[PDB]
Amino acid sequence: EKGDSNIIGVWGQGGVGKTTLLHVFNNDLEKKAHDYQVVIFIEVSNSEALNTVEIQQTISERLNLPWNDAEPIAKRARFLIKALGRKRFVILLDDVRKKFCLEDVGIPTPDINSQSKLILTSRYREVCFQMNAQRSLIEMQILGNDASWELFLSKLSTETSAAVEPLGSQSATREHAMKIAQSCGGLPLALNVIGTAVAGLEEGEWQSAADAIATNMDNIDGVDEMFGRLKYSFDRLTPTQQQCFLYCTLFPEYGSIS
């Protein structure tokens, strides 16, 4: 609302509430009163090759335009630039991974003379900077301890939740659960996967699960998809950068490196 710069970038680690933030913001735009005529949600993350046809189809569908198949891509881009130039649009680009020209796909770059705002999300500060968003950049902070604990409970069955929730009386089950939850570091994706894996845990196996999770998460079910989910941040780097990155795992846990 108050921002003088109309291109807003939101960045955070892999799997830390971003797309969810866009979903909640989009659903919350419904309640408030605003002068923005059209709200468009675009997922450019579907490719690193800039699948332009899909984005143009989404924009045309959300603008009530008649979609054509044989139309050349550049002509449709020009037509959409002209069309979106006559409306106040809020376009939520989701999970951009490489710089791409907004005009080439068909999205006009908003300026101070126009009332449109373009919100885009990315894992990389560099991508947000390349899109002229440098002075409206938001770092997605991870969840706090209380929010982490509240989320962790919601992924447990009532049978297991009954042995963890109670307060007043202190039992090792709650401490072990907290030790498991605090190992996730408030990352919502990690919290979801870990809680789902240990949803059906009994009272006996809290000790062993807490002992193992603190050291190796490899054996926990569903973690493979989690790592495949974020792996891409690693593969984007040149092998020198990748080798330097694994070097940082040498140092002790939860410390600090000069």
Tokens of 239: 């092998």
Rounded to a whole number of angstroms, the minimum distance from the CB of residue 139 to another protein is 9
Among 72, 204, 228, 255, binds another protein (CB under 8 A): 204
Number of H helices and E strands in the chain, helices first, is: 12, 5
Residue number with CB closer to ligand ATP (19 or 115): 19
Contact between 195 and 152 (Cβ < 8 Å): yes
H helices present in 107-205, as ranges: 125-130, 145-153, 158-161, 172-183, 188-197
Instruction: Pick the piece of the chain touching another protein (CB under 8 A) from 9-17, 69-77, 86-94, 196-204.
Output: 196-204
Contacting positions for ligand ATP (CB under 6 A): 12, 14-20, 45, 95, 123, 151, 188-189, 192, 229
CB-nearer residue toward ligand ATP: 17 or 106 = 17
In whole angstroms, how close is the CB of 31 to a second copy at the nearest point? 13
95, exposed or middle or buried, with CB in 10 Å at 0-12, 13-18, 19+? middle
* Non-local CB neighbours of 178 within 8 Å, separated by 6+ positions: 149
56 beta partners: none
Q: Of 85 and 166, which has the nearer Cβ to a second copy? A: 166
Which tokens in the block code for residue 175? Answer: 């401490």
The nearest distance, CB 5 to a second copy, in angstroms, is 33
- 255: exposed, middle or buried (Cβ count in 10 Å: 0-12, 13-18, 19+): exposed
Does residue number 126 form part of the binding site for another protein (CB under 8 A)?
A: yes
Number of residues that bind a second copy (CB under 8 A): 18
Least distance from a second copy to the Cβ atom of residue 154, Å = 8
Task: Name the residues that contact a second copy, by CB under 8 A.
Answer: 125-126, 129-130, 134-135, 137, 155-158, 161, 196-197, 199-200, 221-222
